Amino acid sequence: SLTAYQASSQARVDAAMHTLFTAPSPELARLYEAMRYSVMNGGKRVRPLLAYAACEALGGKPEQANGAACAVELIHAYSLVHDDLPAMDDDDLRRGQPTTHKAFDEACAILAGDGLQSLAFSALLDPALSDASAEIRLRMVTTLAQAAGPAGMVGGQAIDLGSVGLKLDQQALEYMHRHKTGALIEASVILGALASGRAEKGELKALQTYAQAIGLAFQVQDDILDPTYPALLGLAAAKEYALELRDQALHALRPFDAAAEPLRELARYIVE
Amino acid sequence: SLTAYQASSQARVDAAMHTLFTAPSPELARLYEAMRYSVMNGGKRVRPLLAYAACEALGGKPEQANGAACAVELIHAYSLVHDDLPAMDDDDLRRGQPTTHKAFDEACAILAGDGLQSLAFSALLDPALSDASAEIRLRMVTTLAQAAGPAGMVGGQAIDLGSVGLKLDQQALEYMHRHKTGALIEASVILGALASGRAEKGELKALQTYAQAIGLAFQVQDDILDPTYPALLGLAAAKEYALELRDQALHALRPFDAAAEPLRELARYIVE
């Protein structure tokens, strides 16, 4: 069961993010309210969960990864605010409640997303949210900018938009997913690992292998619960593929002890 | 005359940014083209000029500030791409050529701006674009995220939007400008100064005083050439105020030697 670990992760990151959303002046209140609305929506905080779990897998205290956890959630939240816009996916609703541009307006939602990306970087380097060494933290910000930007998440979003009118094979679908969601999932694990201050070369490699497998497993399983994997492979083959990806993620964690159990539970959870 | 220094600054940052805009794959080509279109538009590169000039004022070689210069230009360029959108300012044209959402589409422009912000952070920490120490570079990224985000540039943009229907006095107008454009102008100078590796407490304070004065001077003079400063103060008083702000900027640079001449020339240039 992932229930207890999800609850602890959600509570920890929500409490850490609390301070980030108070406006320094009344003039800025609406902007900060719109950012709060975009993050404090009851979200499951899978990306924070991954950062905390990676940090603990390497012997770190989970709060060591607060900066990592806030950063990846803030990037995730900004991406959704922009994804919802009329020019993008055009959603009036998310999670049954109005999207940010509907509750506020389009301009406010564009700016809320832009400010959330900046806040993600601020959170990464905030001394109240962590304490890693300077060369380690350099790896942190570099990793987040690469994962979030035009060669990672934003790139994936652009590939998705560009895939309208095209007929994608498995390789093309996987490439798009690896960028659109895989990059930030991988950054979540790698940032958490780094936050422990204890992350070696071999451990990080195995955690990368784990992270890429769970990144795809999420997407394959999303399609199963709903170009898709069941269409390209067949439902039976897609179901099989989801289990294979989970097994790949688990196999990557074979070198680790019991402290990596939450990461194992997350992999199992995906296909349950 | 600022002519030679503007030319050298524009050339240096344009050459440094060149590499940042090649897509790692054909699937990402359109996104990278849209980002290139948004930056490589013949821009004057005032923010790069300030970073280079601040770096040289403290004895640094200008290319030491390439990371700073690229970062502030990329943040500036992203802000304009988003400002131009139909939900924001709604401009079909910029500089006489089509805006990014008109040359491409709205979704592509939203993503181009989002990717440019991420690229700004990557450029700051790129080893091919500079070489400062880890505690200095930490000051760099922290500064950029604060200046660009919801308590700086994005905040200013939100205040501007929120000032529709309100009647602003001078204090309110100045507050908005200090955020909307002042924060990034100040970050340009401070980042450049830091890039030298030689920046002391007193020097940075004086450079902050300089940067805030030129930030406002630009706005007051923009209004003169066109809520505005001539409306609030009277044309005569506004003209006077522009000269006062220039004089404040110059006075802040009194401790510095001849190496600060480009910063002095920029202050004089504003009101010429």
From TrEMBL, chains A, B:
Is this entry keyworded Metal-binding?
A: yes
Keywords tagged on the record: Isoprene biosynthesis, Magnesium, Metal-binding, Transferase
One Pfam assignment: polyprenyl_synt
| One GO process term, biological-process aspect | phospholipid biosynthetic process
Alphabetized SUPFAM superfamilies for the sequence? Terpenoid synthases
So what EC number does this one have? Answer: 2.5.1.10
- Residues annotated to bind Mg(2+) 4: D223
Q: Which cofactor does it need?
A: Mg(2+)
Top-rank taxon: Bacteria
Q: What GO terms fall under cellular component here? A: cytoplasm
- List ligand-binding residues for Mg(2+) 3: E135
Quote the InterPro entries the UniProt record gives: Isoprenoid_synthase_dom_sf, Polyprenyl_synt, Polyprenyl_synt_CS, Prenyl_diphosphate_synthase
| Positions contributing to Mg(2+) 2 binding | D83, D89, D91
Top enzyme category: transferase
MF term (GO), any: metal ion binding
Q: Which CDD domains match?
A: Trans_IPPS_HT
Tell me the residue numbers annotated for binding Mg(2+) 1: D83, D89
Family stated for the protein in its record: Belongs to the FPP/GGPP synthase family.
Give the NCBIfam families listed for this entry: FPPsyn, PRK10581.1
Q: What is this protein called?
A: Geranyltranstransferase
Q: Which gene encodes it?
A: ispA
